[PDB]
Amino acid sequence: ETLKSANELLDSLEHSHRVDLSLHLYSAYLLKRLLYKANEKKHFYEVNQFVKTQIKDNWTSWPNPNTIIDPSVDKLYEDIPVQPGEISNRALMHASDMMRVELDAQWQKFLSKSALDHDVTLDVDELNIPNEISRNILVKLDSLFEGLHDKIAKENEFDVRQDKHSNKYTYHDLVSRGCEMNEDMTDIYMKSLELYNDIPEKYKKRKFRLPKQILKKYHQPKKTSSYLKELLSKTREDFIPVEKLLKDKRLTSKDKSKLQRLNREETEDALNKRTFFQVKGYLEDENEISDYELDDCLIEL
Amino acid sequence: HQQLRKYVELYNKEVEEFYNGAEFHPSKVHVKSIHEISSVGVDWDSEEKNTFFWCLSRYSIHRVDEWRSLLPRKSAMEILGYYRLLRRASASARSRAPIAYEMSAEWVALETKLSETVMAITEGAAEVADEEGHCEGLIDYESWKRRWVAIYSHSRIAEIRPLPRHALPLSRSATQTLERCVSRYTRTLLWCTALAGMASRSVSARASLPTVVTRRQVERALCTEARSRDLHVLPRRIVLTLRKWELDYPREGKLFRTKEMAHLFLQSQLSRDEIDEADLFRSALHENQLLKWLSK
Amino acid sequence: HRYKPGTVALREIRRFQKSTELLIRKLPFQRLVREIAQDFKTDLRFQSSAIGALQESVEAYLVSLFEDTNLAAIHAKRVTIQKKDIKLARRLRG
Amino acid sequence: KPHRYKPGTVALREIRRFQKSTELLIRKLPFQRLVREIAQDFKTDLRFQSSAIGALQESVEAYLVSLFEDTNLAAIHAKRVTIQKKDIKLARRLRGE
Amino acid sequence: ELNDYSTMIDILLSDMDLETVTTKKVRMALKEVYAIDVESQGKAINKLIRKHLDLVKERPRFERSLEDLLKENATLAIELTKEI
Amino acid sequence: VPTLQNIVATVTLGCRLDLKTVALHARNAEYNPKRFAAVIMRIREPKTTALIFASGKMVVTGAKSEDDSKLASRKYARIIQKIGFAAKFTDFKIQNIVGSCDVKFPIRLEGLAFSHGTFSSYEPELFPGLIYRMVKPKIVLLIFVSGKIVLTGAKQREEIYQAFEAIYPVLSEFR
Amino acid sequence: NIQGITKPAIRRLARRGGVKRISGLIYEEVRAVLKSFLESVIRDSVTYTEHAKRKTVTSLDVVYALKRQGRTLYGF
Amino acid sequence: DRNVYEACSVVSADEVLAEKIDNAVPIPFKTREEIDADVEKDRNEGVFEGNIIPDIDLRVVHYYATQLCLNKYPHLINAFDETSLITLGLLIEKWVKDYLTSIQTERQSKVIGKGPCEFISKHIDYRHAPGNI
DNA sequence: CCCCTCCCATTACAAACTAAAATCTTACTTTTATTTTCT
DNA sequence: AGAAAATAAAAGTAAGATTTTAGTTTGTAATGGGAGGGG
């Protein structure tokens, strides 16, 4: 009967819902953000421990020597321009081949949408992204990662040299990196605000309150002498970085919990402002210096 | 005896051509264009074709990302697409280049005299030197005057070998531009060090979590930043200045006064041709027609 | 009626050939590339496409330098470029 | 008008002399006010250590020294008697803006 | 200024063979040597070339080698420096 | 109002197709007549899968829109023609459009089983959802526990929207 | 072997940049710029090849070498 | 499982995450249709255009980034989170659209206009010439 | 197995200090560049 | 017009006084391992 057709219809929907990664990465972001907002005013220690120990960082952290997952999309289509778990140049060349497939899909999707608006029929034999264009985009993507890696390597060498002489990335960093590559990230920044700030405000935090059973599990010790005030008075430096202060063993769990709550609130405001300005650019003074022009070269007698 | 005015128009006309240099009939360009009823493709106007070919000579197609602004209505696909057809057409076309004329040593001697004479008359129209700048401004020009008499006056560059003892004076309009330049760079520097560490908060020990900028972070930012950020390091500038001006200085002694800035320098560093004969003849004729024109 | 792709005029082909022709001869440039490789004590071998890519990027660099060199001559109210003009452009760019 | 027809040797004393904090081209107090004003654009509680302002000053002074060197080279190229605005504009043009 | 352009045309015609001379060829040579803008008053400019092209059939064709050009260029250059 | 997901187009090729040769010529199309008597190939950008018969009839599956299905069908016909079999693109016909929407209101499906059980069936063992068949316009729709009402069997966008509008008040009530 | 780049090559290159007349003593200076730039691109091309552990230099290595200098190249 | 990449390569990643937290709170899943529904007011105002969630296959981007980093940049292991991968897809989509946009007026806008469509245009009359395709 | 508080050994490092290298003051001679007289 | 002489400017030489840099010492906070308990 029609049940088999309906069963096949249901399986396709479930298969499509499983395959797409963007919505699953977003759901992980929304789960962590909603949990903190609903449980930051009270029980910050419980929710921080609950998130950190159960929804671990390695849930979405990448890349790893593990999770070498081959999409293998170049063996599926023809409308296009290795042993499992292998890490080699053959795998790298294989990875680039499937990247060009993804760029081709974006190229054809953009043109097809524009053609319909402007009422133009397209020749299907020329919709392929040009090889020179795609090769340049792959170089750009490669240069994006080597810029991040170069900064880490140079910073490590700087720290090592000073020591001898003396003796995590989020969408904020990706936006900042694009600005360093002299790209206009105003459009992406506006889209990032909607996805990461405006949409989560629609959710009702009352639904994401931690249950009593979980709260009792992650209880912290109580009635312990605080050491932050004594530590701050006797310190030598005028300012103490929060990251150094969070890992210090002279502070009790309650001391760190209050600092972590304050740090999370202040960092988010600082991160939002930092990428807002980096997108805007430092040329806000608008006191532009005129360029060497034709008028500066002519001779009058 | 009017070579001076004749040279001036020659210079002025050449300068305009060098700047405003950007013939071709309008046509529709399509990806299937093959060889040398309605036409199909994208419209390429005469001013667009002229701009495309002039830009191609002045900048390679590899720099299309920059000069595509001169073709506002043409996307990078259309510009690169047009280049692809022409390359295919040119290689498939039947075979059969402007040169720069090599001038004699006598011509450049005459031209230098003409150019120097022109600057003498036009020197009266130049802006005059300023009176004095005070401590309200960022730049202290007294230090610059002391530098020139002590460092740059010893330069061994042959082309500028007779060097004035004292630095050249600056006009008032020039000083304003320099004041604006350092303000622009200060914004660039702050946005690379102060804004970068905006997200790293600290605890006010000797009392919110403020953001603190330290010399450790500034030097780290200067050394580990991308070289395209054009961030300058003072100890690195000193060695570059000595090489640039070919100054002679002792090498045994220590260049930097303090170990900290000497250390900072170390951190930054580790982070029978018939073509020729034809061109010679054309150049000799080209110089001949110019000399006759001036000799009139 | 017939819908036909717009033809490229022959004067457009000649202008394109004038603009994009590789002015440096391939053989002398190839020998210079080999000398640099052996002067680096390098056993790596350069493909023909790699040599062509090196050449076509050299012309783009040289043309850009001559454009800056002409600006130096213009600044001195001169219509011909000299050795001192290239030296000034090199010093300021570097 | 005076000229040095024999380029001597730049001894280390005046090379080291202008590495001092008091001999820098950038002035102490005006640069501090400029830094604070620019930092005021960032709507956050941002503070500078005393040594941090000095470190920024050396970097800023390094840029101005480079700009002055190229501006003077352009002025000498044009045989100027007074450095003009277009000499700065030419140097910036040949520096890649 | 029209008489000034006439001298330029006379100089250009004195050193090119008249077999393949075209009004466009001389007009191109004007921009190549003297950088004068031919687009403005183009019709007036073209009249001068045609007028001058009739007068160059009288004299005969004299071809001077590279050596003759080099020695005469030196004479003109050193003489021009003296007036300055 | 509901968003369509799957589109199936019916395109007939005038020529007679040899499934064995086209599979070898195609880069990634897989053909095995033992299980299925059609050539399977997919294109990336439209994300459409086409079934290629030896008789020349071709049905594509996975288009996000009717116009995209025509574009996807053209590419499928172009690929077949590029082999050299002289296929022809004629008689384009959309045969089924599948649309769905989420009411965001959790609705129990047990009540709709017996409130109107003549044209609607709910076999919990056979299907997790409720089978609902409404007469006019002719679209088959399924009721789920969460409320993700899906619609299938329509022809164009005008009909599929009106089907939702008729059942919009029904899904809002019967909590 | 730097003399392989002959005089006519430089004269035509200068005209492309807008230079109409040249001194005639600049050829040696241009060749110095010729070699110096060629050193940097070859050095980075070989360096990028070692990091890929390959035994030859291809056009992509030159493209990546120029990208590190902020220069674009199109592989037509 | 231990990853969302393995969970997205009958049980979905949402179910794995729900059992990872013992179903303490509902899992906030937002489909593409719902995501666009919550930005339609700002989309109408023109503050932004296009989709805010990438359509590119992030699995392909992840595999390329894995191979690139594990072969050349070993210091980037585990250095990114979910938001970095989502934003990376948006930035890659931006690079492709960069090669197709132009300054077009109707004030001026930087959009995709006449040019790229007509440059590869083809008028087809299937009624009389169905062989063009 | 991972959380916590607490211990304790070592190391980092700013402050104070000593010391040696650099440089400033005074005076002088000697080389370099400008200007006046002369042919 | 050019040279040759005159004069003045500049740099070089020196020693003793004074400032700056470089080395050492030292106190104590900073840092991380570890045991122990508790779940």
Residue numbers in the entry:
A (entry chain E): 35 to 115, 123 to 208, 227 to 360
B (entry chain D): 3 to 24, 31 to 44, 55 to 114, 121 to 231, 239 to 302, 339 to 363
C (entry chain A): 40 to 133
D (entry chain C): 38 to 134
E (entry chain G): 3 to 86
F (entry chain H): 64 to 238
G (entry chain B): 26 to 101
H (entry chain F): 2 to 10, 20 to 116, 119 to 145
What's the paper's own text on this?
The yeast transcription factor upstream activating factor (UAF) represses Pol II transcription and mediates Pol I preinitiation complex (PIC) formation at the 35S ribosomal RNA gene. A six-component protein complex, UAF comprises subunits Rrn5, Rrn9, Rrn10, Uaf30, and histones H3 and H4 (17, 18). We found that UAF recognizes DNA using a hexameric histone-like scaffold with markedly different interactions compared with the nucleosome and the histone-fold-rich transcription factor IID (TFIID). In parallel, UAF positions TBP for Core Factor binding, which leads to Pol I recruitment, while sequestering it from DNA and Pol II/III–specific transcription factors.
Using cryo–electron microscopy (cryo-EM), we determined the structure of the complex and found that UAF uses its histone fold–based structure to recognize DNA and that it interacts with a conserved regulatory surface of TBP while sequestering it from DNA to enable specific Pol I recruitment. By cryo-EM, we found that UAF contains a hexameric histone-like core, composed of subunits Rrn5, two histone H3, one H4, Rrn9, and Rrn10. In the refined structure, UAF occupies positions −85 to −54 of the DNA, whereas TBP is held away from DNA by UAF. At the Rrn5-H3 contact site, spanning positions −86 to −68, only the N-terminal loop and N-terminal helix of H3 contact DNA, unlike in the nucleosome, where the rest of the H3 histone fold also engages with DNA. Consequently, bound DNA is translated ~10 Å away from its canonical position compared with the nucleosome. At the Rrn9 contact site, spanning positions −65 to −54, a helix-turn-helix–like element runs parallel to the DNA, making contacts with the DNA backbone at both major and minor grooves and donating one base-specific hydrogen bond at position −57. Combined, the two contact sites of UAF bury 1673 Å2 of solvent-accessible DNA surface, spanning 33 bp of DNA. At the N-terminal lobe, Rrn9 and Rrn10 contact a conserved regulatory surface that is also contacted by TFIID and TFIIA during Pol II PIC assembly and by Brf1 during Pol III PIC assembly. In addition, the N-terminal helix of Rrn9 engages in hydrophobic interactions with the DNA binding surface of TBP. The structure of TBP in association with UAF is therefore permissive to higher-order assembly with Core Factor.
